[PDB]
From a paper:
To gain insight into DNA binding in the GntR/HutC subfamily of repressors, we determined the crystal structure of full-length NagR in complex with an idealized palindromic operator dre-site at 2.9 Å resolution. The asymmetric unit contains one NagR dimer in complex with a 19 bp fragment of dsDNA. Electron density is missing for several segments in the effector-binding domain as well for the peptide segment that interconnects the effector-binding domain and the DBD in each chain A and B of homodimeric NagR. In detail, helices αE3, αE4 and αE5 are not formed in chain A, while chain B lacks most parts of helix αE3 as well as the N-terminal ends of helices αE2 and αE5. Regarding the interdomain linker, residues 79 to 83 and residues 81 to 85 are missing in chain A and B, respectively. Apart from the striking absence of beta-strand β*, which occurs in the interdomain linker region of the GlcN-6-P and GlcNAc-6-P-bound state of NagR, DNA-bound NagR features a highly similar topology consisting of nine α-helices and nine β-strands. In the DNA-bound complex, the DBDs of NagR are pointing downward in direction of the very C-terminal strand βE7, which is in agreement with our previously proposed NagR DNA-binding model derived from YydK. Surprisingly, the orientation of the two-fold symmetry axis that relates the two effector-binding domains in NagR does not coincide with the two-fold axis that relates the two DBDs bound to the 19 bp palindromic DNA fragment since a crossing angle of 6.5° can be observed between the two local symmetry axes. Thus it appears that in the DNA-bound and ligand-free structure of NagR not only secondary structure elements in the effector-binding domain are considerably less well defined but that also the DBDs are more flexibly attached to the effector-binding domain than in GlcN-6-P- and GlcNAc-6-P-bound NagR.
NagR, formerly termed YvoA, has been identified as a repressor protein from Bacillus subtilis that regulates genes involved in N-acetylglucosamine (GlcNAc) utilization. NagR acts as a negative transcriptional regulator, and binding of effector-free NagR to specific DNA operator sites blocks gene transcription. With more than 49000 deposited sequences, the GntR family of regulators (gluconate-operon repressor, Pfam family: PF00392) represents one of the largest groups of bacterial metabolite-responsive transcription factors. Their tertiary structure can be subdivided in almost all cases into two distinct domains: an N-terminal DNA-binding winged-helix-turn-helix (wHTH) domain and a C-terminal small-molecule effector-binding and oligomerization domain. In NagR and the entire GntR/HutC subfamily the C-terminal effector-binding domain adopts a so-called UTRA domain fold (Pfam family: PF07702) that is structurally homologous to the enzyme chorismate lyase.
Numbering used by the authors:
A (entry chain B): 0 to 81, 85 to 112, 114 to 123, 125 to 160, 166 to 240
B (entry chain A): 0 to 79, 84 to 124, 126 to 152, 178 to 242
DNA sequence: CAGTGGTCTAGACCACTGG
DNA sequence: CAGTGGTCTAGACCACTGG
């Protein structure tokens, strides 16, 4: 039971997206069942087929619908989410309360390797946090960021990056590698020395196709498994 | 320079997509230098604005270009992979993959295994290969299929080598290994292969790319 | 067959951007 | 200001599925 206002400042395709999205969650529409036609939709609202099509085409492009030559447009088979996740979002996803304990900060310059994150010789933020879940330490996170891409700040946080620049967030590159806990890794995380940890190098790009952050993290092997989902 | 076949059975946006893709890889077009206007493209080829826009839109959707309201459409710099087997994963690393079978079986279905995919307690293939890279042991892989493309689910977990694990791979016992459970589903929405692998920590790092908005 | 998505056209106004 | 992507319209032919 759908409603579209051509007069609204909110684009018509978006109105059609946002509402259908809920008609699916609410299961008012059922998977492996066709929707009204592109042409039928276009009439019911008194808009152009292509304007129907832009919303539908976006939803299919997001996996919520699918198409069959000569038959129609169909709703889909539900999904789960994790791409592009931070620790806080990774935890809320596992039903846990994310936490943060700052343990180190510095401003240091740069070897050639730090320059490899698309250096703009420059001054860098180096925040070393301890990541927690239900107040249990889960990981140690060393985050690397330039002043040529963030300047300075007093944080009290993802959006600052897209805010300080033209560009939004896009794609990310994670490198995982297994290790045994060093005595300081072990100490902080509260595990035995030599205990299995997971070393994650996450470098993150703008839609610029430019990276802003390179993060070396250490994750406890006992309480954390990396879950991933591709294609 | 760029060429459009309006009569051809391959659509015009796809023609535009494909060529542009190479002008970007080849660097004929430069990152952070804008493309010709949407309107400029439409004239230069003598086609409609919107069908140019379908090509670009698709490319921007693939991470290869980005748009700036009021300014234009710009290129992005980064490199390519995606969708992994052991063997494509190695070729990607400049290496020649190999396989040595060390076990094969058909066993009953236990419920935990059975919970993935359908019915169980039903005939399951269990192939255990030792995976090779330029003739080095890299992993020990126990792959599971019932005998009865799309999405994949990988779970990584770090560990220390058990003594037989160490044995095969030719590494010290207790050495850092990487435990990967790779479940892959068909377009059916039904699971196809469940693989429990063990990877040496010394010579292997897991690499992975993410998208979202 | 009448219906459907996939593609395509030749125009239109808007909000936004930079100089 | 003039240019750009963002949106929209009212038509069109096609190749394809089903009864």
């Amino acid at each position: 039971h759908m409603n579209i206002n051509k007069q609204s400042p909110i684009p018509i395709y978006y109105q059609i997206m946002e509402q259908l999205k809920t008609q699916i969650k609410n299961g008012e529409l059922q998977p492996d069942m066709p929707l009204p036609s592109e042409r039928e939709y276009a009439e019911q609202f008194g808009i152009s087929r292509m304007t129907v099509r832009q919303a539908l085409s976006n939803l299919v492009n997001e996996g919520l619908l699918y198409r069959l030559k000569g038959r129609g447009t169909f709703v889909s088979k539900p999904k789960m989410e994790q791409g592009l996740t931070s620790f806080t979002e990774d935890m809320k996803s596992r039903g846990m309360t994310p936490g943060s304990r700052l343990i180190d900060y510095q401003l240091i310059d740069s070897e050639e390797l730090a320059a490899i994150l698309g250096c703009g010789p420059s001054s860098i933020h180096k925040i070393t946090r301890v990541r927690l879940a239900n107040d249990i330490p889960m990981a140690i996170e060393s985050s690397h960021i330039p002043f040529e891409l963030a300047g300075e700040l007093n944080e009290s946080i993802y959006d600052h990056i897209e805010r300080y620049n033209s560009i939004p967030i896009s794609r990310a590159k994670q490198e995982l590698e297994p290790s045994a806990a060093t005595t300081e890794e072990a100490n902080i995380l509260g595990i035995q020395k030599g205990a299995p940890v997971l070393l994650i190098k996450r470098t993150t790009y703008l839609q610029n196709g430019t990276a802003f952050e390179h993060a070396k993290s250490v994750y406890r092997g006992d309480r954390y498994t990396f879950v991933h989902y591709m294609d």
